[PDB]
Ligand binder design. Structure first.
Ligand SMILES: CC(=O)N[C@@H]1[C@@H](O[C@@H]2O[C@H](C(=O)O)[C@@H](O[C@@H]3O[C@H](CO)[C@@H](O)[C@H](O[C@@H]4O[C@H](C(=O)O)[C@@H](O[C@@H]5O[C@H](CO)[C@@H](O)[C@H](O[C@@H]6O[C@H](C(=O)O)[C@@H](O[C@@H]7O[C@H](CO)[C@@H](O)[C@H](O)[C@H]7NC(C)=O)[C@H](O)[C@H]6O)[C@H]5NC(C)=O)[C@H](O)[C@H]4O)[C@H]3NC(C)=O)[C@H](O)[C@H]2O)[C@H](O)[C@@H](CO)O[C@H]1O
Length: 150
């Protein structure tokens, strides 16, 4: 197995994770993924603070309770011109990206490279953290605890 995890800069500890392809994480896998990063699925208030510090993406992703996109600037193809933490209301489907929250991060923007999946456990997968600047960190292990996700 090989799994690539593209991670963004953290904003008030909140970051975005894309696994392999766009929108391929379930809600259970997302919770396990954040846990592997010693993080949690963000609360809405945590996400709102991150947005205020400059966090935005053009990707739907899990937080605690909902699927959201943080938007600073209005774009027609990113939450249909909405700004703020846009909550996904209507979808047939169950697989998105995820957000995670790391309490130990700096309070503002942190674009240093993520170098580990610290809480990952023993397993057969090559897990590679890919940062936006291309710097990579790989380890062998596993983070999924539901067979359905494997
Ligand atoms: C029913 C019903 O109809 N439903 C209603 C519902 O409608 C739905 O809305 C959805 C929505 O969320 O809007 C729609 O979903 C989208 O559909 C689109 C088409 O179908 C999809 O394309 C889109 O996917 C997203 O596309 C994006 C894209 O831009 O192509 C992707 O984002 C890009 O990702 C890239 C890779 O990561 C990024 O690099 C890029 O960011 C840009 O990067 C630039 C760069 O580096 O080149 C950068 O440019 C630099 O900028 C700096 C300044 O900061 C300069 O200094 C520098 O010079 C620049 N460099 C250059 C250019 O030289 C830019 O800053 C930066 O933007 C990403 N682009 C963007 C836009 O950020 C993204 O990854 C794809 O996911 C779909 N979107 C989503 C969210 O999935 C759907 O179609 C509809 O069904 C409504 O939402 C709802 C409203 O209530 O109502 C329902 O009824």
């Amino acid at each position: 197995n090989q799994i690539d995890l593209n991670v963004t800069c953290r904003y008030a500890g909140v970051f975005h994770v894309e696994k392999n392809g766009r929108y391929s994480i379930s809600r259970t896998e997302a919770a396990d993924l954040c846990q592997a990063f010693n993080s949690t699925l963000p609360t809405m208030d945590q996400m709102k603070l991150a947005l205020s510090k400059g966090f935005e993406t053009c990707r739907y992703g899990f937080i605690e309770g909902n699927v959201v996109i943080p938007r600073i600037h209005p774009n027609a193809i990113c939450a249909a011109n909405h700004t703020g933490v846009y909550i996904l209301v209507t979808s047939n489907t169950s697989h998105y990206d995820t957000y995670c929250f790391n309490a130990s991060a700096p309070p503002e923007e942190d674009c240093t490279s993520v170098t580990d999946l610290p809480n990952s456990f023993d397993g057969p997968v090559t897990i590679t953290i890919v940062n936006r600047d291309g710097t990579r960190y790989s380890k062998k292990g596993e983070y999924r605890t539901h067979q359905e996700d494997i």
